[PDB]
A paper describes a structure:
To gain insight into the conformational transitions involved in the formation of a ternary cleavage complex, we solved the structure of a binary complex involving the same S. aureus gyrase core construct and DNA. Even though the overall conformation of this binary complex is quite similar to the IPY-poisoned ternary complex, this binary complex presents some clear differences from the IPY complexes and all other S. aureus complexes with DNA. However, in the binary complex the TOPRIM domain is rotated by ∼12° around the Aα1 hinge (this hinge region is discussed elsewhere), so that the metal-coordinating residues on the TOPRIM domain, including D508, have moved too far away from the DNA, preventing the metal ion from binding to the TOPRIM domain and also contacting the DNA. In the binary complex, which is crystallized from the same crystallization conditions as many other S. aureus complexes, no metal ion is observed at the TOPRIM domain catalytic site. In the binary complex the distance between the two scissile phosphates is 21.7 Å, and the DNA in this central region is in an A-DNA conformation. Comparison of an IPY-poisoned ternary complex with the binary complex shows a sliding motion of the two GyrA subunits past one another when transitioning from the binary to the ternary complex. The SaD83 residue (equivalent to EcD82) is situated at the ‘sliding interface’ between the two GyrA subunits. The two SaD83 residues move apart when the complex transitions from the binary (unpoisoned) to the ternary (poisoned) conformation. Modeling a SaD83N mutation in the binary complex suggests that the unfavorable interaction between the two aspartic acid side-chains (SaD83) observed in the binary complex can be replaced by two hydrogen bonds (not shown). In the 2.6 Å binary structure with uncleaved DNA, the equivalent S. aureus residue, D83, makes direct contact with its counterpart across the 2-fold axis.
Numbering used by the authors:
A (entry chain C): 10 to 248, 258 to 491
B (entry chain A): 10 to 491
C (entry chain D): 417 to 545, 580 to 639
D (entry chain B): 417 to 545, 580 to 638
The structure:
Amino acid sequence: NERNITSEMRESFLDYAMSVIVARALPDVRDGLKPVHRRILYGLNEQGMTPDKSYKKSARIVGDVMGKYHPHGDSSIYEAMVRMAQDFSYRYPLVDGQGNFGSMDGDGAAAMRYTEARMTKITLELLRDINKDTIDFIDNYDGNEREPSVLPARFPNLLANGASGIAVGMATNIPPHNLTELINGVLSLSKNPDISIAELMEDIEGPDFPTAGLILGKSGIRRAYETGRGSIQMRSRAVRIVVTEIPFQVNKARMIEKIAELVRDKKIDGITDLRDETSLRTGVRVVIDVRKDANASVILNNLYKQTPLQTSFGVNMIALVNGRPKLINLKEALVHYLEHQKTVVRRRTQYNLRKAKDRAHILEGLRIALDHIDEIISTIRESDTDKVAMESLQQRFKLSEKQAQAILDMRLRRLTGLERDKIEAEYNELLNYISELETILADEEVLLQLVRDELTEIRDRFGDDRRTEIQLG
Amino acid sequence: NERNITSEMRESFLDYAMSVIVARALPDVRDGLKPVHRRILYGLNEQGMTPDKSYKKSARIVGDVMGKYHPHGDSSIYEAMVRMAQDFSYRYPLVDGQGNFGSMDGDGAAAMRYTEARMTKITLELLRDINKDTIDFIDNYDGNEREPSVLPARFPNLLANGASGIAVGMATNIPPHNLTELINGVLSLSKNPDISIAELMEDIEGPDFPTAGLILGKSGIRRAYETGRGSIQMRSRAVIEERGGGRQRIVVTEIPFQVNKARMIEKIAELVRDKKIDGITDLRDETSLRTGVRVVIDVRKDANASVILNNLYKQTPLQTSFGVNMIALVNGRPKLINLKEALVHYLEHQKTVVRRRTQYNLRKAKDRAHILEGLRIALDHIDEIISTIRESDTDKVAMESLQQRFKLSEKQAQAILDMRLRRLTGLERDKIEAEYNELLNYISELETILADEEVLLQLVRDELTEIRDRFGDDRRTEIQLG
Amino acid sequence: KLADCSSKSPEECEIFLVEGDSAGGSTKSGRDSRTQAILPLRGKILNVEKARLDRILNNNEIRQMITAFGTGIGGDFDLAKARYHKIVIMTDADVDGAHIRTLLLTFFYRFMRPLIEAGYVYIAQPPTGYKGLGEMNADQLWETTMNPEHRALLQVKLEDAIEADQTFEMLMGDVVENRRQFIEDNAVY
Amino acid sequence: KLADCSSKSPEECEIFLVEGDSAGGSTKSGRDSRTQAILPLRGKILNVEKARLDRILNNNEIRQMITAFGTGIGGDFDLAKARYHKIVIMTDADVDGAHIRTLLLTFFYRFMRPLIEAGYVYIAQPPTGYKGLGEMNADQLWETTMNPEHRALLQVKLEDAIEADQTFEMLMGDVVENRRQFIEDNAV
DNA sequence: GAGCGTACGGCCGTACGCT
DNA sequence: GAGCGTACGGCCGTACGCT
């Protein structure tokens, strides 16, 4: 057999490129997660590592995720989980870590056998209603497990925590945002489908970095929200000059070493010495002793230009839409997210209705059984096999195969006085529950309001203050 | 606060030394396993990675152990698991591996995400009866899991697969043996507690390496079995063949245990290069899967191949010593043990395992018989039973009324309340009586085993004989005399 | 790192380029050591369409291949000096295997083009039921991938020089947009 | 690798020798960077009672410590040139932590004895509730292990020179049998 | 005396896109 | 330009006991 070099190159490069794109480097628009991150969170859910239970070692999590969902190096899983637990990396941290989870100076986390982890309260919201047929499950790498294709994501995580990823033919770079502003934006969009980006910007002012700092103007922000692309200038908070906030993803130690380099090589002048006075007590504090009679305003402006004291955030909003990479603007991101929420709620309601209708049918048969229990027992006792017992029960009491099966599976303890009253009470309550569920599915506006109400609750519970100041000009 | 440097040194060195000894480097006499190996095998058991089910990726087992039992680097677990799957390392391999599990030339196994593993059929025997209260379970490192302190080990693994470990103040080096010879030795010991080492050696001839080869004499073997220490000379299997044209060649078909074939050949090559050995024209590794180990050493015309071969035994790892130093954990303490001591501790372990299994089975059977007695009373008076439950407001009242009226226990009354309506059918009613009668006979059989220590001892012998007939194989290493 | 074959007749000699010591050990065990050589490579090689000559020549994995093949490079290339008449690119049927295949073909196209033209370059991957070469036992690796009596090798053929030059520049070159457009246009397959 | 303190007054300055970059990062975050320095070490150091001088002097971790302390080695040793009056051996309460403690004390006994004699060498480990330093958050690492206000440091004292010389030779020396006998005699 | 096997530390290289 | 983060490759070093 033979193969054309061109045909082979095109086929192999495409297989590699699409796999990095759809199954590695880029996040899904709906939940804002890359496969490895979704697996960590699903793993924490299945292992019951919820906020209310005690911490478990990272090795216990990593090992589970590695063996059940992610057959790649255990360090790739651990490294991704560590970042999720860093308050300087995640605007809304997804992992609640105990121990050394790394620092702003690029110091690594301790070995996974030393550190402990569990879900954050906000991660409960990413997983909320996952076992209510809200999302599609797919087979794991070996067919022995089932894993989610996407998470319900009851908060707009993609925009909230941001994203970055290098793929093939493309890359992504979405900054993080304020949760209050985002939910307000979704709520404004839910009330007006024809909303403009400019109108949305009345809610979502711009990015909001966990590391705070400043943003120079709204021009870059607007360009990025309008097109999906735009440079956003991030500036350190500086007022001898004292630095209290540095830009997002900037290594403080490397930034200080860069300033120290500029003073040694006589690139900058009018500075005696520089000291990192950062502490857990005082927070970020970088102080620079300015030389007598020299202009600190001029020195500071030069530091913004020559060092990472002022850094650009190159916005390139790429995410997976219908399993395909797409450059999305601010409105598109919120539309896909709101559409996802509507589906999650609709599917949850449809699941709850199937579950309720099925139970109501069972309780109908149990009610007939309990009303004529002396006749029921005689019928079963007379029967040689369970098949005969079932056919005879269906024929005399007009019961379904499912109802007759539930009676044969009924324990003798269900024959007590209080147990019959419990069945009637459950049935009547269920009849009303079914009615309530049917009202939600009959009116698209009632369903849409339920999404709004559930989002408002998240906003009031997890919504916090803006950290990054958007400076006028 | 202050601390004496001497007190601190002694305290810290002792804590470290004990931990390496009891919880790292040395095997237990009973199952022949170090903590990491026991964990891998327990992990495979709990994850249902049995011989009859499909292979799963090595990463699933490693990750599970990492994991629930062994909070150390995942490489330590994988590396130990790899060796257990090597037929040139393990006389009776404990892991059934699919994929690249390394070679005799020291080539590593493929990444754990590519390789696949499960238990071997013989590993089922190491774990046999583990959930029948045969062995003591201990809490795992974080208290979230339970792990075995020792495995039931229905075959003498310590001696069968051997061991090696560098600890603190001591080291271990137990050679592997033949399973047939070992079980025969245990059976001879079971019949005569006062058996001599010399008598045991009529069953256990000496070590049996997976890599075959030869052993020069029985002097070293005897010394090692008598004292627990002794040097055993391992020689490669080499024959002098005719090339043609009056020329000769040495052909190596078996090499000593734990000798790297590639490094051995590189040593021969180094000596011919440095002129430290003469009469060798060529040296090539003609090893294949189909033909097995084959190392050809071309000998120069008119030069004596017998002299060249004898020099190779002296100057290269073609002849290597196995320094026997049989150290194992006895009652959680390191001990230098001879051949008899090793078999005594193993036989004692087997007697306990079977006694405890029988005692467990009896408790389990007696408990079930009690439940069936209650169900039989319930089915004989079912119309009465139903009336009692119907008249009761809560389950507590229903239970108290059933116990008082029909002289039932709390357990019996509970089983009746938990009884499904399906169980009142003709076939289900007969199933209960049939189970009860069969159980009565089973209890009698169990009680017969526990009443006579000789019947129990014979059961150990019979169970060991079954293992021997099933997994016992031919001797590979020739013990030359010597 | 090369595990050479006993035969010195290039016509009958074959070399298998395997990813890592992870496939090296098993192929070294499974091969016919008389006519089959193994060159284990340390993962992804340099993209020679992007990299400059000085960086390429200082790369150990690139050097090892040049040394093993004998031939030489570009202008100093000699097909008559080729130590093997079969150079098999052995990769896994996965994301990383696919990339390794493209990087190796790129090296062969830019530095050893007459080797492809002579029909010496071949492609092999695990048979169906296997995704990676590390999943296979040496006997199966032999019987399905290495045994000339019943194996599945694909001979790499150069049909159109202009189309190939364009393909290698589009897929492996510095211009991301051409690659992005190709991905966008062929994503369905 | 050393994360030095701002102060240059040795009497008030302290150095914490931590096992790995795994404890380095958290202690660097939790410390009072004014008077506390951190020297992260790359695991188990050389056993100086077994190793020869040429091997010891070429070891980059041994070199790092000598450089950081600023005292020098034997022939050029000077206690007045000590850059810190507190050298804190920070290890975990486990098998590997215990060994690291013994190897470090062996180095200080054979090459920097007056440092122990001056009461500059201290021992710290995690408080009860933790086994390893990597389990702790930087704030707890500060509040329980580094905060001079409320910490648990053990000052290493040299009480009997003959007994210490014998202890270090028995436990860390070339003769395995003396160590084996000690283990056998003191096993619990 | 470099290697064995349990444990632990480190360092370096490759692609990929954007700035 | 050299980082970022997902993936993958390699290379060393320490103790410990006995050859």
